[PDB]
Subunit: 262 residues, 3 copies
């Protein structure tokens, strides 16, 4: 009887250590749940182009699925809500980096895409490109005090991309919102590029001026919500341990009935 | 005694609240499990190219790892199971969009890749590209009645890509199958592009005709099965709650022994 | 009384069956936990370029954020720890594939990037590119016996990429470490390309020699640790089941009190 009681107590202690260690492990490695919430119209995204010396020639919201034939090389109709700012980025506070903010397409369901055009007069770069950062809401920037702070924060909160000459980078930008355990939800942008070579036959002259193109489009109406989940909470652990403790008490009590039997 | 009994009852009520709220939460945010099932030979994938005015010049299944030297510009050997169809997409039912379906490589382990060539006679598009959609099984399309319905369904069930001129888009297409809770398993295609500029020195004449190239390849023999998991089920919850309720009953009964002691 | 006892026994049998089945299911589909561990300085990555006939012209570690103006076409300063090897890959053991290993950037926080230049004398390929494989630690290769075995293993442990002519493939290489249940942690590279067309105006002569460019950079200081988790372990299952068994015993005993009542 004493032997089996000691065995049961050893099982209980082993189980307590077991569950405590398993709870410690399950707190370090929370599992993630990713859910897609279809959205009919995305909030106006903010595209932070950094033209530098480049000159915008045209910007439009092509509600259609395919851009129409344009008139490249010369200035064209401007039909975008473009905001311009000059600030100093925190990572290179010494230098001032001028940006150029544009309002991206909203009608994702209707396949609305904003097509841009840029041009740069002859220079000696030999690797010409225009950076661009994407942030979730353009209106939020358009109505936020101290735009310099907002842009500096975005410089850290978003990674740097770019597009180059003789190309039409068709950036199918998409959202992925991350929720950290503290409750706040950070929003990050995913985007897949598809470079489309520019057939420069139309000028066919000594113009030969760097011409850039981009088509910012919403990949699909799904917003990928990614949130970490803590699979282990002390509540379930304590309930399970109490159930096991009672399970052991009943076995010990049945040992007394066995003693009476013998 | 009454005070401790009321305390135990309050613990029971607040704990059943705990568990019911947590269970309600755990249905909303199911956790995901991703498993890779190595496959020796993928099912013949269906590549739905939309040449438009472009003219296919060559299509082959290069069992080797590297394409050999070709004869660009002029028609070449055709060695692909190409299916042609004209239909109207649901999103643009007004217009008729002609497709061109091809049978992709199967021998993933052997690094089998299907290399295509397209050509377009001089036009005034100025951004020339050929769309292409990928669907899981080409034979399923080749033996399914009402191909128009199948293609229209695919137009919604797969995203739109394309490749452009003077390029060799080496699309390393890969599979990712999703299982929704209802039981059906939707299949989606992932594919990473690697644009390879075309060195057009060979013609070096007034031909200067848009020439496209693509190399559809299976990235690896792994099919990424993604399935959502409901971490919480009512019966684990009810068992845990019953264990906790018994654990509370035993404490209340030990309170009677304490009363006898005092 | 016998009817309710049989009902309780049937419930117990159903519950044990269901718990065993659910434990069997939860062992097949383990859930994954992905954690990002910020790293100040990545270990020197090993870039296994396969120039073939191409001739390296320059390699440098640009601690700045932007490459400076270069002197394309002619040999330049070489400031990289380049290792050269010729071996035979397992998949094509018949042929010998010569590689060229380079020491990649380490100072991720400083936006340190290694910029390379390659050149190929006139050939008849018309699709010119240089393959490159990424492996986690360059020093590990630099101090490992039988480098041929290391390279052959990497040929299977990493996928094949490449960059082409007239381009500056800005490969923002990033790390993702996978832990299989056995305990070993396989390391894989994710990398997103951004092709930047090369404006070849500077030579403007009959040189017209294939020039390749690449900028290998660390995307961000986060290492994506991906590890599978077994949500079900026999120990929780047995504790829950025996707690439910006790919950059944107490109900059966309350049935006796009900009998006494009636």
């Amino acid at each position: 009887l004493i032997f089996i009681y000691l065995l049961l107590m050893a099982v209980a202690v082993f189980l307590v250590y077991r569950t405590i260690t398993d709870f410690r492990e399950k707190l370090k490695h929370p599992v993630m749940s990713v859910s897609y919430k279809e959205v009919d119209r995305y909030d106006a995204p903010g595209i932070a182009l950094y033209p530098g010396q480049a000159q915008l020639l045209s910007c439009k919201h092509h509600y259609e699925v395919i851009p129409p034939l344009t008139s490249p090389g010369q200035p064209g109709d401007m039909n975008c809500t473009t905001q311009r700012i000059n600030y100093t980025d925190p990572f290179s506070n010494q230098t001032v980096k001028s940006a150029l903010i544009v309002q991206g397409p909203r009608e994702v369901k209707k396949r609305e895409l904003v097509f841009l055009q840029f041009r740069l007069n002859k220079s000696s770069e030999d690797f010409s490109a225009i950076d661009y950062l994407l942030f979730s809401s353009f209106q939020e920037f358009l109505q936020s005090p101290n735009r310099v702070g907002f842009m500096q924060a975005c410089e850290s909160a978003y990674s740097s991309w770019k597009f180059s000459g003789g190309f039409r980078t068709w950036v199918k930008m998409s959202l992925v919102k991350t929720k950290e355990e503290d409750g706040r939800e950070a929003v990050e942008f995913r985007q897949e590029t598809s470079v489309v070579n520019y057939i420069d036959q139309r000028p066919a002259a000594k113009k030969s001026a760097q011409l850039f193109f981009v088509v910012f489009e919403w990949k699909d109406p799904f917003i990928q919500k990614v949130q970490d989940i803590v699979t282990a909470n002390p509540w379930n652990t304590i309930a399970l341990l109490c159930g096991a403790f009672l399970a052991l008490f009943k076995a010990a009590e049945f040992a007394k009935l066995s003693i009476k039997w013998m």
